RNA sequence: UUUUGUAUAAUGGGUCAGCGACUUAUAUUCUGUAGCAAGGUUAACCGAAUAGGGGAGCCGAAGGGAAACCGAGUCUUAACU
RNA sequence: GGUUCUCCCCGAAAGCUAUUUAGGUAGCGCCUCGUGAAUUCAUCUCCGGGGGUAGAGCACUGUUUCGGCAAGGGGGUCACGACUUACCAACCCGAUGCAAACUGCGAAUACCGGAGAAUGUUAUCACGGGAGACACACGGCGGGUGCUAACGUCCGUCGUGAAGAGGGAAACAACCCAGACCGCCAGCUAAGGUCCCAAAGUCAUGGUUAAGUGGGAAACGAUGUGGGAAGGCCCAGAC
RNA sequence: UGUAACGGGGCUAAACCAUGCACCGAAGCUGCGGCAGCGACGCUUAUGCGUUGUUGGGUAGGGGAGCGUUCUGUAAGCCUG
RNA sequence: UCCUCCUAAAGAGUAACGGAGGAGCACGAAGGUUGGCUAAUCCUGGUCGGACAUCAGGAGGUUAGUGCAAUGGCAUAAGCCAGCUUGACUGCGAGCGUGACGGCGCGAGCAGGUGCGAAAGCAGGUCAUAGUGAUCCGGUGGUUCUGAAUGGAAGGGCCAUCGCUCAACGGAUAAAAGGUACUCCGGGGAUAACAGGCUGAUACCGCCCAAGAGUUCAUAUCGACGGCGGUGUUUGGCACCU
RNA sequence: UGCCUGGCGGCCGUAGCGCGGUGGUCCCACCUGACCCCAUGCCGAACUCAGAAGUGAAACGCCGUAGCGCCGAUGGUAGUGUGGGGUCUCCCCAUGCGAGAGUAGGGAACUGCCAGGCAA
């Protein structure tokens, strides 16, 4: 629906299966790195899963 | 004196609810009956349940024992 | 070097120089490349000869069936929805 | 056992099945290169699914404690009638438990199918050429085995090592943070730290500790000390 | 064998609990310079890119591209008392 | 080798010299169809007869039964009885399950010809899951398919079928037991024996509770029934080092 | 349209059991006979045929009753995915999901088609 901003903030390295799909289906690459979306259901579920290491501003 | 066993024999449901099937396919594979035979579907002699029909797979509970169907509908 | 794992107190080497280990022949399959193309190519041999002759032969364009046999069909079956 | 020049790209496995087979080998799984293909595939949301695991429970199969009613059984009064009991006790009823091989119940996850957006260098599948590997190890979680012993052994799933340097835990493959293309006497951070060795707070506020606790260890013992909720007796005067 | 159960000095806060603001801290991230692979697009079309995004730890192993040595032709040419 | 349950962590699969049990069949009917029927265990009455034979009634609703161990299933009964029967049939087979493969399993439907029923319909063995062995070689019956000059035949092929506790059950031969301290070679700390290491069941030592003994009195001295620790001094476990 | 009745279903215990009441105008049941149709591993029991006298006893349908079965919250608890922590053979924190049993309560059904009688 509006902007959201992305950012993450933790190293992916012994992290399961499932939340490395989840970094690569959200475009986050590397720490630090900020990626652009948009607000949405499927997009908000993405965030809580990996939550711990993302951080997220509206 | 133990040790023994026997091959596992891989039954259980093949197809579940709500995913279209060819006919004849297999759809549960059971020792007795747990489920029975509904609309469009055919009970082998091993009690083996199979498609008689093209269509969407479902399970229901039906008859005064709440005994599990299932059924075939052609959509 | 070998191992799940070696500074390991596991193996090998005192040092230097020299030598020292995936080759070769004939077949078969795949890839690249070159020639020709429903055609492609000769072997032995002949040859004042890396030329030119030599098409014996091999591979390919048609398959199915155990086979006879049939043939863009064939086998299965008394016969195929 | 050994196998000799350089650079660039990708990158494993120590599994299954069979084997006079177990330290070999073959097919498959996993790797690589090429060719051709469908929003093929993954994550998330929603929808359609079947479970019998955790937990729970005791209807069932077993096991277990207490109380009652108590058929029935023994001794005793009787004259084929019949009766009592200080004594044994079935089946049931009420309450309490236990179970991998119990289920009248039943998750979370996982798995299968469908629709949808975003994202990902097609990450997917099929065919062809070439492989290696089939001695795994530790850590977390769920277990069998052992002594809920072993850096023990045997499985399931994820991570790391193997095949990953760097920082941290004094030193310490497998623990925590984090994935090194090269250069810089540039900056900000992670785990972990900031009195000195040794980079950074002898920083601020309110408490605790007297033991060098911190900086190994239990049953159990004790006017150590701090806080909280109460209770009995108390200037008709308590200890 | 020697303190030897904070790494040591040493500490009564330099210990522990709660809150807060600072700083240090890696080859992580950012800044600057350089190299290479891969996919796109604006355009060069056997190649640079005014570009764009991303990737570049690595054993067994697979793929790609190169250096150097001896000898043959180029070469009775070229260098050399 | 094969079958059932658990281990197995709610799809499938999943190891151990982990915990429990079974199979190497049976049946021309115990198969097919049509028609009909519905147990175990208790209570009461009744000759032998008795707790437990058979009869009648009642509660009960499957604790019964299902040829064979276990699990799942079974009232439309797959359980029990009777009539008629041979579908325990031939040629196929869309489409699926399961395996590395060899292979194994389920199956609507089509053609031919049958059984049961008035008929719709059911029948390609048995409630299902074990009852099994590749290939080679050779035997028996059918079939001009072939049959090396020709016509035959022999021998092969095709179809049906027969011969292995080849049980070490993917079966190395049709055919095979021991000793070596007289020993040898290639390897391994992948694997034992001495020592180290980890662990601490066992052992040794210490402590907690306290029944009791000790002239009475648990704790002068011992201290049963039980409990919690330390040491790595025994006997052990593991196989990390050589 | 209503009280009823029979058949075929949907739905399946809030629908099933126990106790009491209620029904014969039709329908239903019981009931008479069975030489013939048909059957008893003996029996008109059951099945079948010819009938309708009698009856609502039994069975069946309806009503009432909670005495049982059954259904059943809210809250809490157990467990649990993901990420952290501990005096780590067991637990705690943040977030997500969230039982079973029990409690309050509900509860002695609802509904479609056809056919027949009475009143309309």
């Not at chain 2, 609309?39 to 269509?55: E, I, M, P, Q």
């Not at chain 2, 229901?60 to 005994?67: A, L, T």
């Amino acid at each position: 629906a509006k902007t959201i901003k992305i950012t993450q903030t933790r190293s992916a390295i012994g992290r399961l299966p499932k939340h490395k799909a989840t970094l690569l289906g959200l475009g986050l690459r590397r720490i630090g790195h900020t990626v652009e979306r948009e607000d949405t259901p499927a997009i908000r579920g993405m965030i809580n899963a990996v939550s711990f290491m993302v951080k997220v501003e509206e | 004196r133990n040790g023994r066993d026997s091959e596992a024999k891989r039954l259980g449901v093949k197809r579940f609810g709500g995913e279209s099937v060819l006919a004849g396919s297999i759809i549960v594979r059971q020792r007795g009956t747990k489920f029975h035979a509904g609309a469009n579907v055919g009970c082998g002699r091993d009690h083996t349940l199979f498609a008689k029909a093209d269509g969407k797979v479902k399970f229901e509970v039906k008859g005064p024992k709440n005994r599990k169907f299932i059924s075939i509908e052609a959509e």
